Design an enzyme around this catalytic site. Sequence first.
Site, PDB file in Angstrom:
ATOM      1  N   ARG A  56     -15.872 -44.735   7.405  1.00 49.16           N
ATOM      2  CA  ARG A  56     -14.479 -44.307   7.312  1.00 49.16           C
ATOM      3  C   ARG A  56     -13.629 -45.205   6.496  1.00 49.16           C
ATOM      4  NH1 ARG A  56     -16.341 -43.304  12.342  1.00 49.16           N
ATOM      5  NH2 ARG A  56     -16.513 -41.130  12.944  1.00 49.16           N
ATOM      6  N   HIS A 124     -25.542 -45.776  19.811  1.00 48.15           N
ATOM      7  CA  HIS A 124     -25.838 -44.609  18.967  1.00 48.15           C
ATOM      8  C   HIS A 124     -27.258 -44.560  18.487  1.00 48.15           C
ATOM      9  CE1 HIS A 124     -21.214 -44.530  18.060  1.00 48.15           C
ATOM     10  NE2 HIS A 124     -21.524 -44.232  19.316  1.00 48.15           N
ATOM     11  N   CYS A 157     -47.627 -42.661  22.125  1.00 47.94           N
ATOM     12  CA  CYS A 157     -47.533 -43.822  22.932  1.00 47.94           C
ATOM     13  C   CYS A 157     -48.906 -44.472  23.219  1.00 47.94           C
ATOM     14  CB  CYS A 157     -46.834 -43.417  24.213  1.00 47.94           C
ATOM     15  SG  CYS A 157     -46.495 -44.763  25.315  1.00 47.94           S
ATOM     16  N   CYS A 161     -51.142 -43.427  27.765  1.00 45.24           N
ATOM     17  CA  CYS A 161     -50.047 -42.474  27.974  1.00 45.24           C
ATOM     18  C   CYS A 161     -50.109 -41.279  27.009  1.00 45.24           C
ATOM     19  CB  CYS A 161     -48.703 -43.197  27.864  1.00 45.24           C
ATOM     20  SG  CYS A 161     -47.250 -42.113  27.942  1.00 45.24           S
ATOM     21  N   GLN A 226      -8.823 -51.788   8.168  1.00 45.29           N
ATOM     22  CA  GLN A 226      -7.984 -50.620   8.330  1.00 45.29           C
ATOM     23  C   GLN A 226      -7.366 -50.703   9.741  1.00 45.29           C
ATOM     24  OE1 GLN A 226     -11.096 -47.590   7.807  1.00 45.29           O
ATOM     25  NE2 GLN A 226     -10.191 -47.034   5.824  1.00 45.29           N
TER      26      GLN A 226
HETATM   27  N1  LIG Z   1     -16.274 -56.597   5.697  1.00 44.07           N
HETATM   28  C1  LIG Z   1     -15.393 -56.010   6.549  1.00 44.07           C
HETATM   29  N2  LIG Z   1     -14.568 -56.737   7.326  1.00 44.07           N
HETATM   30  C2  LIG Z   1     -13.683 -56.173   8.165  1.00 44.07           C
HETATM   31  N3  LIG Z   1     -13.579 -54.835   8.353  1.00 44.07           N
HETATM   32  C3  LIG Z   1     -14.432 -54.015   7.655  1.00 44.07           C
HETATM   33  C4  LIG Z   1     -15.310 -54.542   6.655  1.00 44.07           C
HETATM   34  N4  LIG Z   1     -15.999 -53.514   6.106  1.00 44.07           N
HETATM   35  C5  LIG Z   1     -15.510 -52.394   6.643  1.00 44.07           C
HETATM   36  N5  LIG Z   1     -14.544 -52.715   7.531  1.00 44.07           N
HETATM   37  C6  LIG Z   1     -13.786 -51.808   8.403  1.00 44.07           C
HETATM   38  O1  LIG Z   1     -14.726 -51.457   9.368  1.00 44.07           O
HETATM   39  C7  LIG Z   1     -14.432 -50.189   9.966  1.00 44.07           C
HETATM   40  C8  LIG Z   1     -15.606 -49.331  10.179  1.00 44.07           C
HETATM   41  O2  LIG Z   1     -15.241 -48.080  10.819  1.00 44.07           O
HETATM   42  P1  LIG Z   1     -16.077 -46.723  10.740  1.00 44.07           P
HETATM   43  O3  LIG Z   1     -16.517 -46.564   9.346  1.00 44.07           O
HETATM   44  O4  LIG Z   1     -15.166 -45.757  11.457  1.00 44.07           O
HETATM   45  O5  LIG Z   1     -17.403 -47.052  11.647  1.00 44.07           O
HETATM   46  P2  LIG Z   1     -17.536 -47.148  13.219  1.00 44.07           P
HETATM   47  O6  LIG Z   1     -18.705 -48.032  13.423  1.00 44.07           O
HETATM   48  O7  LIG Z   1     -16.279 -47.436  13.929  1.00 44.07           O
HETATM   49  O8  LIG Z   1     -18.010 -45.607  13.441  1.00 44.07           O
HETATM   50  C9  LIG Z   1     -18.363 -45.187  14.780  1.00 44.07           C
HETATM   51  C10 LIG Z   1     -19.381 -44.107  14.637  1.00 44.07           C
HETATM   52  O9  LIG Z   1     -18.781 -43.035  13.830  1.00 44.07           O
HETATM   53  C11 LIG Z   1     -19.782 -42.507  12.942  1.00 44.07           C
HETATM   54  O10 LIG Z   1     -19.897 -41.087  12.962  1.00 44.07           O
HETATM   55  C12 LIG Z   1     -21.118 -43.197  13.389  1.00 44.07           C
HETATM   56  O11 LIG Z   1     -21.758 -42.409  14.438  1.00 44.07           O
HETATM   57  C13 LIG Z   1     -20.634 -44.584  13.933  1.00 44.07           C
HETATM   58  O12 LIG Z   1     -21.644 -45.221  14.811  1.00 44.07           O
HETATM   59  C14 LIG Z   1     -13.436 -49.479   9.000  1.00 44.07           C
HETATM   60  O13 LIG Z   1     -12.243 -49.295   9.623  1.00 44.07           O
HETATM   61  C15 LIG Z   1     -13.249 -50.491   7.814  1.00 44.07           C
HETATM   62  O14 LIG Z   1     -11.947 -50.776   7.410  1.00 44.07           O
HETATM   63 ZN   LIG Z   2     -45.551 -43.525  27.033  1.00 48.36          ZN
END
Ligand SMILES: Nc1ncnc2c1ncn2[C@@H]1O[C@H](COP(=O)(O)OP(=O)(O)OC[C@H]2O[C@H](O)[C@H](O)[C@@H]2O)[C@@H](O)[C@H]1O
Ligand SMILES: [Zn+2]
Length: 282
Positions: A56, A124, A157, A161, A226
């Site tokens: 995101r 996840h 497995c 199993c 963000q």
């Molecule tokens: N180097 C950095 N330093 C600080 N912030 C960072 C950096 N790089 C990126 N960011 C920030 O890092 C944030 C990453 O947010 P998102 O991308 O929403 O990932 P999630 O892990 O929360 O997504 C959750 C689930 O959603 C999905 O569908 C999957 O299923 C995921 O498992 C952003 O706001 C960036 O600004």
């Molecule tokens: Zn097994």
Amino acid sequence: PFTADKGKCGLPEIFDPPEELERKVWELARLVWQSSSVVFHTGAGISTASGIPDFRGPHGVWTMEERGLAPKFDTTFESARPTQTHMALVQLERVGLLRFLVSQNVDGLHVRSGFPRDKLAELHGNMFVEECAKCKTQYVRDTVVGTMGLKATGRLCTVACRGELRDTILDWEDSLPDRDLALADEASRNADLSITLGTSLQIRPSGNLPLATKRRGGRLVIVNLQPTKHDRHADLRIHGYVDEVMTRLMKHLGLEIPAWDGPRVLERALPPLPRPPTPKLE
Ligand SMILES: Nc1ncnc2c1ncn2[C@@H]1O[C@H](COP(=O)(O)OP(=O)(O)OC[C@H]2O[C@H](O)[C@H](O)[C@@H]2O)[C@@H](O)[C@H]1O
Ligand SMILES: [Zn+2]
Ligand SMILES: c1cncc(-c2nc3ccccc3n3cccc23)c1
């Protein structure tokens, strides 16, 4: 699934200026020093500095899809190295300053960094892990398991199993793994400090766990470029690259960031190492 809600994608990044960033990282050290029980929550943002795109962020997977462009990988999952942040988390658990680690990443890096799987919730899934549908035994492989959505991988497995092995990568409809969610929620509820690193906190329930720490007056720190869904609930929000925040924090704590030996799997946490004595906080 094609219309699954992908949340708010591509919001502007914020950069705390240098002196504010330093003050806030001092205050985080101060909160770490005061806390009995510290839980870290990580998302996709901690792996971007190893070449794995987030979801995101301005060039994230879902952000780029919304614009009709493709995300870019600067590595395979197999060739990815854990970041400075990943290695800091290793060290913090070894000295007893981290109680539990809750992650939304499927990238396999926390495991591959040598972080103990009994102090980790992988909410996840993990793309290197497959699981026996019959006896539940997990196998941590050296290559990415070729399927997603809890499907049969084609292997069986080997426990003393023949159950069908399946991947652990959750699809949009799949509920979270019960063990991991329950452990993460217990840690989060009993924590007096939760610290979020590179997660926008948009996914429930994963993104809501840090809020549980608030319940008996615990503190919440958010480290993210963000905005996040729970910014108004934070006692401290630090807007900066996580590797810069974590290196400075480790320097304040008197800790080195340890060397990565290459991919290694640790099942159970080792006995805690010595740590620096703590400053007087008036
Ligand atoms: N180097 C950095 N330093 C600080 N912030 C960072 C950096 N790089 C990126 N960011 C920030 O890092 C944030 C990453 O947010 P998102 O991308 O929403 O990932 P999630 O892990 O929360 O997504 C959750 C689930 O959603 C999905 O569908 C999957 O299923 C995921 O498992 C952003 O706001 C960036 O600004
Ligand atoms: Zn097994
Ligand atoms: C972490 C960060 N950014 C993207 C992913 C990702 N890349 C994937 C690449 C191809 C096949 C499936 C994938 N996949 C399935 C769940 C997640 C993924 C993981």
